[PDB]
């Protein structure tokens, strides 16, 4: 998570990129309370439970949008940017993060690395990248790959200048996705741990082995792959 949130160059909305991120150990604490994110919000999953609900597979996307337009990255509304470039299925189960950033992105006098579609024939089916710029065709004289009357170039540009107001600053946005499926999950929350006391009746928990009793040191010798022992009648009488 640390590098995506700190990647130096984010792509523009139309060319948003993914990461088939899996088989790892998330930790949303600092991500939640980094005290810098102007817009943290999400759906489907509460902002606090998400510390531990283990996930099947998670996808991370990122782009850069105009400032005020940020709201349009949410299910069930419209806006030129959410209309043609990126929209979220109404059964969305992830989280959306946005924070102001012109101190990194607004080259003074004007940034021109960030472009977004304006005209397309069809509204955009959720979760697709449509990179190929197409000249818009309107009424008579439809135009393809040419510039003239009745022909409109689709990729406009952001003029991200620091002299702009808050409403037009650039925003680096990153959006997550979570889902529940059949095969056993692969990305769980960080697991709280603690010291171990001996010779007292305690409630222990080793990895999921749960019980209560008094723990002493032993004279057994497991096999390197063996994680706990049990006796006849199948009660746990040792642990690693």
């Amino acid at each position: 998570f640390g590098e995506v949130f700190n990647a130096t160059r984010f792509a523009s909305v139309y060319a948003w990129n993914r990461k088939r991120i899996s088989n790892c150990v998330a930790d949303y604490s600092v991500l939640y309370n980094s005290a810098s994110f102007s817009t943290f919000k999400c759906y489907g999953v509460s902002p606090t439970k998400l510390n531990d609900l283990c996930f099947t597979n998670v996808y991370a996307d990122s782009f850069v949008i105009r400032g005020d337009e940020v709201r349009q990255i949410a299910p069930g509304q419209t806006g030129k940017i959410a209309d043609y470039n990126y929209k979220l299925p109404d059964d969305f189960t992830g989280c959306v993060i946005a924070w102001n950033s012109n101190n990194l992105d607004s080259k003074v006098g004007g940034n021109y690395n960030y472009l977004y579609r304006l005209f397309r024939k069809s509204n955009l089916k959720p979760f697709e990248r449509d990179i190929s710029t197409e000249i818009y065709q309107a009424g008579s004289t439809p135009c393809n790959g040419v510039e003239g009357f009745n022909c409109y170039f689709p990729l406009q540009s952001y003029g991200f200048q620091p002299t702009n107001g808050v409403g037009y600053q650039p925003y680096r946005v990153v959006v997550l996705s979570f889902e529940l499926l059949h095969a056993p999950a692969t990305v769980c929350g960080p697991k709280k741990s603690t010291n171990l006391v001996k010779n007292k009746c305690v409630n222990f928990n080793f990895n999921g082995l749960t019980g209560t009793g008094v723990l002493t040191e032993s004279n057994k010798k497991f096999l390197p792959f063996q994680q706990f022992g049990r006796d006849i009648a199948d009660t746990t009488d040792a642990v690693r």
Partner: antibody
Amino acid sequence: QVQLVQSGAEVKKPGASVKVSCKASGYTFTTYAMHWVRQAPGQRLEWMGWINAGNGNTKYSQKFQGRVTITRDTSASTAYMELSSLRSEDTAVYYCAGGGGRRLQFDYFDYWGQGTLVTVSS
Amino acid sequence: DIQMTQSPSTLSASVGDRVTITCRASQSISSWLAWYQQKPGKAPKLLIYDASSLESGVPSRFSGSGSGTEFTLTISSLQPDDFATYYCQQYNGYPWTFGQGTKVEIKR
């Protein structure tokens, strides 16, 4: 491998105008970025401006404002430069640069033309 | 406008050695920079962009660093193909400028 080539040597006179041009050869034209820069001999390089080989955009410098112009021809896939009101200083070597490829724009010159020599004399 | 001056000026070396270059900026730069190699009588070749990244097709020796204002290039072993000047480009703001020139030599 993308390569850029362009015109040969020129010699002009004060007050005139000159037109240098470089032809492109790139695997795709994904809003290509022909992007001009010049060098007085034994001096600091100096940056001209960038044409948006995608469509038409023409951001220029400020020391050179109001007297230099840049265009391009789509079919020939070349870039056109134009300067007027020349004077003995602009004696230099002129360069084509650009050619991002992966993303659509940068501001760093990763494909350089082999150089064009311009002499302003009387 | 952004000023770019390199304190290194000319330098000295010998084959199989390491060198360092400093590029200072009059103002703050958010790690926007690139390093160009220019042999005499040729066209510039790019080496480093965004002050860190190593662009493809170059020897692995070259390496960038630095952030903020003071920026640094460094090569481990000095090969013959290293014998030319080196420039730093800022691209924090508008009109994009260049350095002064930092030219290596062959000590004897």
